[PDB]
RNA sequence: CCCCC
RNA sequence: CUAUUAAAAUCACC
RNA sequence: GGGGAUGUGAUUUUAAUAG
RNA sequence: CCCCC
RNA sequence: CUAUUAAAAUCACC
RNA sequence: GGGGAUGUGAUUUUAAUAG
C-alpha cells in the first residue's frame, strides 16, 4: 500500500489511460500492463477525447533545495515575524456530477477578515493539455455546511480572486512586514488552496525597489515587494506554520475556546482563520515576556518609547512636588531604575519577579486590589505600564489601551492585544472599571530651569516662572511645544495617564 | 473514490515542482541538490529493433535506447502545469519518447535538457550524426 | 380524528391504558373501546407499576381569562418595555431508552451570559400520579450537537436549576425594570421549557414591599418583586416576544449575520440568547428613533439631563468668547434652541430633516466627512451628540461612549448600545478614528457673573475674578462644586467630550 | 547489526539526517554512507527545521560506578527499607500524528491516592538542540484505556507536575524514612515515566541541614531532604525494586487477586500502584515474621514499647489478684517471660514452635476457635497480641486494631496492616467477631506497694490505699498519671485491651 | 448472526410461559385475562377434503377444520420448555393437527384443553361420535 | 479511532 | 553450526 | 468528499538469505 | 451513536 | 367537493 | 456475539380510501 492522493484521477471512467497519454505506471489500465511494464497493442487507440479531473490533494513540501527558501518554519522563525502573521482557513465543495474524490476551494477567510468565494475550479486531463477549468460541485453533506450552499452560485473566477487575494495582503502587510506568515490549523486542504494562488522559487528582489520580493505576475513576469503590488496576481514566497502541530487535540474551536471567548462563529473561513491567528497567538506569547527576541522598526516607535519616558518624569517629579507624598511605591518595575531621581523622596520597587538584578532592594509584590487594598494606604504608587485589576485611589497609571489598534498594536487573544514596539509585549483587555477610584490626568507642562532666548506662546497650561509676566522666554517656549507633541505622540498611541483626584494645577503654581 | 496515480517516492518531488514559477529550472535544483529522480515512468516492453527517431507514435527503439510513454516523461505533465510550449500543448503527451539507456535512470530529466534536430527527428548530441 | 402533539404518550409500551387511569380516550386500550365508549372487562387487571413519559411540546398560550395577564405580547409592548428583554434560548436532549418522541431542556441560556445546565428530567404518568423524574436520554444526533456531549455528565437537579434562574434575573433587573420579557427565537421548545420554571397566575403584589410580583415561592406560597426574591424558585409572570414571527425567514444566525458581526458562536444557549435579543433590538430601535415613546426613572436620569445641559451651557459659551467666532453652525440640532441665549456670533441650525420644528430657521443636512468636509470650514461646529463617522477640525463634540455598560445604557446591535434615557437612542459603536482632528476638553469653571462672599477652594481650574484673588469668594466656591459634580456625573454617564485642538483656558483668563 | 530501543527516532520522515546533527551511525541518511563511513556531500544542504521525537523508552539502570548508588536494589534491602515504599504506576499515550513509536507519561499514580495528569511531553531534536516539548498524542486504543480519553483535554505541564510529584513524596515520606523506594510492577513504563521528574548523582546531603539528600532544585542547583524541599522539583536518589522479577506469571491483578480481596480498580495509575504495593508486602511479610532485621526509631516507640509492659503487667496481675485462678495459659508467648514475676498462680507457655529457647517449659501450640475451644477452659488464658480467629470467654487479651493507621502502622495485605516497631509484624484484619466472649476492658490503677506524702487527684479509678482516705498521696498520684499517660499512648497506638465479663475492680479493693 | 423465528406480538405470551412451573395453567390465566392468542403459527395450505383424524402424518383435514404444523401448535415447543409427556416427547412435533376452525383463532389453546379418543384418533367432542 | 470538508 | 530479514504464535506493558 | 494512522518490548518456532 | 457481553 | 392514512419534498426547532 | 433505537412540529404536493 504505497500510493498516495496526491494527483489521483477522480473520473468515472472504468479504465485507464492509453501507455502514451498516461503520467504514471499506475494511470494505464491493465489491458496495457505487461510484467511490470506496458505493451502497445495495435488494436486500442488513444483516447482523444476525455476529461479527467485530478485531486491536487495531498502536497508535501519537504524539499531540501540549495537556493530556495522552506515554506514551512519553525515556532522561533515565526515568533520572530509577527506582523506576517495572517491567519488562513478555506472551506471547500465535493466534486459530483462528473467526478468524484477531490475538494476545491469554495471560500478562502483570512484574519484580515475579508472571505474571497471562487468558483469550483479543478485541474482537469485534456490528451494535449492540463486544464484549469470549472468543475461540477457540490456543497459539503452535513447541517454545519449549510452557510456553503449560497455560496456555490456567488463567487469570482479564480483570476480575481487570487489579484483580490495579492491587493488585501498587500494592504494589510505593507507597513507591517516583509513577507506573510499564513497561520494554518491544517496545512493539508490550505496548501491545496495555495496550489491556487501561491508560485515558489529562489528569493528574488523588487522590481522598482529593493525590497524583498514577495508579489509576482504572470502577465509579465516580474516580482513586486508589498508596495509595488499593483495587478499582481500570486503570491511569491509565502512562509507558513501549521497549529496542529503543536501537540493540540480536538478541533480548533475547542482549542481556541479554553483560552479566549470575544471569536465564534466556527466554520466560517475568516472566523476561522482569526481563531487561528488567536491560538497562535496565545500559544507564543501570552505566558511571559521575552527579552530576547527584539523587533525591527516598522515606524515612529524610538519616538513614543522616548515620550514614555519624557511624560513619566514631568508627571512624577510634578505631582512630587506639587503635594510631597512621604513614600511611592514603583509596582511592576523589573530593574531598579527611579524615574526621577532629583526626589526628596524614599524609593521601594515592587515586581512580583526580580528580573535577575543582583541588587535586590526591589520587594516581591503580585499586585491585585482585593488583597493588597490597605498595602500602600498613604503615598503615591506608581504603576507605570502595569496592568493589575483595579488601582488604588492615590495613585498614577500609564495604562495602555488594547482598543487602539494600530501598526504597533496587533490583534492579540482574549480581548487583550500584542502591542510589539522592540519586544512584543501581550497586554490583557483594557477595562475601565479599573480606574474608578482615580481620574484622567490633564495635560500640563512643568520645568524649572532658568530662562532666556514663530508666535509667542499665548497658553494658560505653561507652568513655568516665564510664564507669570506678559510673555514667555523662547527656551521654555520650544520646551513646552516638544513637550505637547511628546504627549501627543504617547496618548495617540494608545497609551491613558490617569491620577489621583487630588492632583491639580495650582500645587504645581506654588513655585512660583 | 478515483484511483491513485502516484507513489510516495514522488511526493517532494511533485510538490515542490507544481508550487514553482519555473519548474524545469526547480527540477534541475533538486537533482543538483542531492534528491532522487522522478520514478513511476511507463516503460514499453519493445524488442529493441527499429530507427532510433526520438519522439514517434509507435515505439521505435535501437539496442542502446528505451521507449517510454511521452506523456510520462515530461515535467508539465507529471506535475499537470501550464506547458511553456507556444499554444500550450505536449508535444511528447500521444507519443513515445526514446530514452537512451545510460540516461534511462531519468527519463524526466533527458527531455528537459536535451532537444530533437528538427530535419532528422533524433536526439542532438546523442544520435543526430547531421553536423 | 384530529390530534395534538401535547401530552403525547412518548413510552415505548405498545398497548394503552385501562378505563380508569387513563386521562384521555385516545390513551384506553382497544381492547375497551365499544361504539366510541368503554366497557369495563372484569377480567383485565389494571397495570400498577408503569411508567409513561408524557410530551409537554406542544402548548398554546393563547388563552383569553380575565384576571389572568397574557405572555406573548405584541411588538410595541415589548418595544416600551425594552429595559426587562432577556434573551432565552434553550438546548435540548432526546429521551432514547424507554420513552422516545420528546425533548428535554439540557442547556438553558439568557442575554446575560449565564449557562445553566440541568439533569434531563420529564413528567412521567404512574399509575398514582405524575411524577416529575429524570429520565434516560441522549444528546441530539450530528456534529453541530457534540458540544452536548459533556454537558449529559454535568448537570444540576432542577430545583437548584430554577433558583438560580431566579437568582439571575433578580440580579440583573431588579434595578431596570418591575417585569421580566424573554425574547425567543423560536418559542416551540422554550414554551416547553418553561414549564419547568415559570408559573402564572392573576396579578399579585410583592409581600414585605407594594411593587409587582414577579417570583413564586413553593415552600410558602409567598410571592416577590425581583429585589426581595430570596430562595424563589418561580418566575411569577413572564412575557414573551416570539421573533421568528416578525415576518423572518432562515436561521437565526442567517439574520443574525445580516445585520451584526459581533456575535457568533451558534448552538451555544447563551450566545444563541445574546444573538435573539441583538436581533430583537436591532429590529426594533436601530431604524429610527422615536420621541413619541418615553421610559420610566430608573435613577440619576434627571441628574445627567441637567449636567449635559450645565455643559452644554458652559463649553459652547467659553468656546465662543475664547475664539470670538462670527459663525457657527449647530448639526443634528432639531429644535430652534440655542445653548446659550445670548451670544454675538451668528446660529445656524441643522439636522437631518426637519425635527418637529416645521419653521425655516432649521436646514435638513446628512453629514459625513467623506462628502460634507469643506463646507463649514469658517465658524465652529457644534456636534452636540450627533454621531457622524468623523468629525472636522473646528468642532465642539459631545459623544456617547457606547463601551460603557450601565443602567441606561444596554447592549445593543452591532457593537453598539442601547442609550435608553427618557426616550431610547441606539447609537452605533464608538470608535476614536472619528477624533483623530480633536482633542478631549479639559475639565474647567469659567465664570463671568457678578459676587458676593466655607471651606476655601485652592483649585487652580477656576476661571472667575474671585480666582485672582488669594481666597475664591463662598458664592463661586459652591458654584465650581455644583459644576464639577455635574461634569463628573456626565463623563461617569460615558459621554465624552472633544474640542478643536487650538482651545485653551487663557483667553478665558484675559478678559476679566 | 544489532540495535536498541533507546533514543529510537520516532519521526514519519522517510529519510536520514546529514552527517552532521545526526546523533549516531545509524541515523545517516544512506546518500552520505560510503564503506561503513559518511561522505560529505557538498551539494546537499542540511535540514533546519526539521522536528524528530525521541523515544525514552529503553533504559538500562545497570550502571556502576563508584561514587554513584544503584537504582535497583534487592529484595533484601527493599525489605529493609519498607517505611519508605511508595508504589509507583503510570499510564501512557501513544503519540499520533507526527511521530509514531513511542509512549508518554499521561497519568502518574502513587501508593498514596494521587494521581497526577500530565500533558503529552516528549523529547523533539531539533536542529539546534533537545526541545522537551508537548507533542501529538492520542489514548490507547481499547476498552480498558477509555476512561484516559478525558483525561487528554485536562493535564498540568510537566514543571507543575514534578513540582507536585516532590511535595506529595515529602509530606509522605518527611516522617518516615530518608529514602524512597518506588515499588514498580514492570519497570519498563516506569523509567521511561522518571526520566521526567529524577534525577541521580553522588550522594549529597541536605543544606541548612545533615540528613541524606533525597530532593535537588534547578532554579538553584541545591539539595534537600523530605523535610526542606520547598519548590524542589527534582527526585535526587530513588531506589527501586521490580516486583514482577520475583517470579511472576500474569497480570499484576491477576497475581494481586489470589491473597487480597480490598484493592481492585485495574488500570488506574494510583490503584494500580497501591495493588503493586500490596502484593510486594504481600510477598515480603505476610509469610512469616523475622526478628533478625530491626528498624530505626521514628518516634514514640520507646514510650509504646514500654506502655505495653507498664498495662502488660498491671492487668495480669490485677486479674490474677482480683479472681484468684488457679492455672494460666501463655499463648503465643516466643520467650519464658512472665509479665509478674511473683504471683501464686501456675504458670504455662505456649507459642507456634519455640522461638528461640529451646528450653522445654515453651509447648508447642496453634490455636483456633473451631478445633482449641474446650481444652483450656480452667483458669485464664492471656492472649498478650496472638491473633486467633475467636477468643475464649476466659481471656485478657491485647489485640492491635489494624484499622488505625500511624507513622508505626502502614498499609498491609488484604485488609490487614504491617505495624512496624523495632520489628515488623503483619498483623490480619481486626474484627470485633473475635471478641464476642470478652468485654473491654475498663481503666483503672491499681497499687498496693508502701507509701510515703501536689496536685489532688479525685478521680474515683484509682484503687490504692491512699484513696480509702480524703486525699491520695503524692506518691501515688504521680504514679497514676504516669500510668494514665502510658495508657492513652497504648490505646492510642492502636491497641484494644479485653477482658472476660466477669472482671470487676471491686475485689481490688477488697484485699486491702 | 442466526435467522429470527419470533415476531414481536408474542414476546409477553412466550416469557411468561417460559419462566412458568405450569406453563399450561399459565397460558390459560393469560387468556382469561384478555391476553391475545399466540401468532405465527404454520398454516397448511390444503383443499379441506380427507379424513378428519386429529393427528397425521400429512395433512388429513375436513372442510370445518384447518391443518397446523404439530410442533408450531404445542405450547412446550413453542416455549421450549420440558414437556410433561412420559420420556419427553412431543407428540404434535413431527406431525399434522387438525384444528377446528371455529377455534383456529387459537390453535395453541386448543391443543392444551382437548384430548383425543385413542380408538378412533380424532378430537373428543367436536369430532368423535364412539359413545 | 482522530483530524479536515 | 552462526548471523540477518519476513511471518506466525504466546507473554508482559500501554 | 479528503486524509493520517493504528503504540512498547520479550521468547519460541517456521520458512528462507548470507556466512 | 448508546448500553450489555 | 370534504375528511382520513401512506409516501415524498421543502422549511423551522433540537 | 446480544440488543435497543435513531427526536419535535409546520406547509405543499402525489397517489389512493371513505363520505
Ligand atoms: C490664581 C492662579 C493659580 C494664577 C497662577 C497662574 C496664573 C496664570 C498664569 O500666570 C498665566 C496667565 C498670565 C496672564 O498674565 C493672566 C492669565 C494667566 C492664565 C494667569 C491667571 C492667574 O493669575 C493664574 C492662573
Ligand atoms: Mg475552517
Ligand atoms: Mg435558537
Ligand atoms: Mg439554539
Ligand atoms: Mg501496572
Ligand atoms: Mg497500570
Ligand atoms: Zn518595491
Ligand atoms: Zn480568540
Ligand atoms: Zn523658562
Ligand atoms: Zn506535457
Ligand atoms: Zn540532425
Ligand atoms: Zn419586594
Ligand atoms: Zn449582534
Ligand atoms: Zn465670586
Ligand atoms: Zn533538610
Ligand atoms: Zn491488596
Ligand atoms: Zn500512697
Ligand atoms: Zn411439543
Ligand atoms: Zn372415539
Given at each position: 500500500e504505497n500510493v498516495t492522493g496526491l494527483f489521483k484521477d477522480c473520473s468515472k471512467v472504468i479504465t485507464g489511460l492509453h501507455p502514451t497519454q498516461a503520467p504514471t505506471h499506475l494511470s494505464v489500465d491493465?489491458?496495457?500492463?505487461?510484467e511490470g511494464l506496458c505493451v502497445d497493442?495495435?488494436?486500442?487507440?488513444?483516447?482523444?477525447?476525455?476529461?479527467?479531473?485530478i485531486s491536487m490533494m495531498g502536497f508535501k513540501m519537504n524539499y531540501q533545495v540549495n537556493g530556495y527558501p522552506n515554506m514551512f518554519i519553525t515556532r522561533e522563525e515565526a515568533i520572530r515575524h509577527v506582523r506576517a502573521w495572517i491567519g488562513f482557513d478555506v472551506e471547500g465543495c465535493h466534486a459530483t456530477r462528473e467526478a468524484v474524490g477531490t475538494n476545491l476551494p469554495l471560500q478562502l477567510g483570512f484574519s484580515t477578515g475579508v472571505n474571497l468565494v471562487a468558483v469550483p475550479t479543478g485541474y482537469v486531463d485534456t490528451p494535449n493539455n492540463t486544464d484549469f477549468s470549472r468543475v461540477s460541485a457540490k456543497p459539503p453533506p452535513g447541517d454545519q455546511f449549510k452557510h456553503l450552499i449560497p455560496l456555490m452560485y456567488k463567487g469570482l473566477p479564480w483570476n480575481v480572486v487570487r489579484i483580490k487575494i495579492v491587493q488585501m495582503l498587500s494592504d494589510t502587510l505593507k507597513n507591517l512586514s516583509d513577507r506573510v506568515v499564513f497561520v494554518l490549523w491544517a496545512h493539508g486542504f490550505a496548501l491545496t488552496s495555495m496550489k491556487y494562488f501561491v508560485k515558489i522559487g529562489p528569493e528574488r528582489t523588487c522590481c522598482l525597489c529593493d525590497r524583498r520580493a514577495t508579489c509576482f505576475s504572470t502577465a509579465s513576469d516580474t516580482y513586486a515587494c508589498w508596495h509595488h503590488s499593483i495587478g499582481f496576481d500570486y503570491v511569491y514566497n509565502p512562509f507558513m506554520i501549521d497549529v496542529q502541530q503543536w501537540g493540540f487535540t480536538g478541533n480548533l474551536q475547542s482549542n481556541h475556546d479554553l483560552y479566549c471567548q470575544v471569536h465564534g462563529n466556527a466554520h466560517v473561513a475568516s472566523c476561522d482563520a482569526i481563531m487561528t491567528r488567536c491560538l497562535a497567538v496565545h500559544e507564543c506569547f501570552v505566558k511571559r515576556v521575552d527579552w530576547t527576541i527584539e523587533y525591527p522598526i516598522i515606524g515612529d516607535e524610538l519616538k513614543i518609547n522616548a515620550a514614555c519616558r519624557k511624560v513619566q518624569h514631568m508627571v512624577v517629579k510634578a505631582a512630587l512636588l506639587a503635594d510631597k507624598?512621604?513614600?511611592?511605591?514603583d509596582i511592576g518595575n523589573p530593574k531598579a531604575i527611579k524615574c526621577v531621581p532629583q526626589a526628596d523622596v524614599e524609593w521601594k520597587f515592587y515586581d512580583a519577579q526580580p528580573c535577575s538584578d543582583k541588587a535586590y532592594k526591589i520587594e516581591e509584590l503580585f499586585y491585585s486590589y482585593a488583597t493588597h487594598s490597605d498595602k500602600f494606604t498613604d503615598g503615591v504608587c506608581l504603576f507605570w505600564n502595569c496592568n493589575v485589576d483595579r488601582y488604588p485611589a492615590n495613585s498614577i497609571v500609564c495604562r495602555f489601551d488594547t482598543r487602539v489598534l494600530s501598526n504597533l498594536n496587533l490583534p492579540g487573544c482574549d480581548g487583550g492585544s500584542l502591542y510589539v514596539n522592540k519586544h512584543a509585549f501581550h497586554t490583557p483587555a483594557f477595562d475601565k472599571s479599573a480606574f474608578v477610584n482615580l481620574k484622567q490626568l490633564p495635560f500640563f507642562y512643568y520645568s524649572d530651569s532658568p530662562c532666556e532666548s514663530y508666535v509667542?506662546?499665548?497658553?494658560?497650561?505653561?507652568?513655568?516662572?516665564?510664564?507669570?509676566?506678559?510673555?514667555?522666554?523662547?527656551?521654555?517656549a520650544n520646551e513646552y511645544r516638544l513637550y505637547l507633541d511628546a504627549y501627543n505622540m504617547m496618548i495617540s498611541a494608545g497609551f491613558s495617564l490617569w491620577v489621583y483626584k487630588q492632583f491639580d494645577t495650582y500645587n504645581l503654581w506654588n513655585t512660583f | 473514490a478515483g484511483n491513485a496515480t502516484e507513489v510516495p517516492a514522488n511526493s517532494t518531488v511533485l510538490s515542490f515542482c507544481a508550487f514553482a514559477v519555473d519548474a524545469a529550472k526547480a527540477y534541475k535544483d533538486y537533482l543538483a541538490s542531492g534528491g532522487q529522480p522522478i520514478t513511476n515512468c511507463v516503460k514499453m516492453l519493445c524488442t529493441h529493433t527499429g530507427t532510433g527517431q526520438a519522439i514517434t507514435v509507435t515505439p521505435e527503439a535501437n539496442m542502446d535506447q528505451e521507449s517510454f510513454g511521452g506523456a510520462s516523461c515530461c515535467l508539465y505533465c507529471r506535475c499537470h502545469i501550464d506547458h511553456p510550449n507556444p499554444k500550450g500543448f505536449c508535444d511528447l503527451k500521444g507519443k513515445y519518447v526514446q530514452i537512451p539507456t545510460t540516461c534511462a535512470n531519468d527519463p524526466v530529466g533527458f527531455?528537459?535538457?536535451?532537444?530533437?534536430?528538427?530535419?532528422?527527428?533524433?536526439?542532438?548530441?546523442?544520435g543526430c550524426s547531421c553536423d
Open positions: 491493465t489491458k496495457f500492463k505487461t497493442i495495435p488494436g486500442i487507440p488513444k483516447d482523444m477525447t476525455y476529461r479527467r479531473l507624598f512621604p513614600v511611592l511605591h509667542p506662546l499665548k497658553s494658560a497650561t505653561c507652568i513655568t516662572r516665564c510664564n507669570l509676566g506678559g510673555a514667555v522666554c523662547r527656551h521654555h | 527531455t528537459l535538457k536535451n532537444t530533437v534536430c528538427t530535419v532528422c527527428g533524433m536526439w542532438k548530441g546523442y
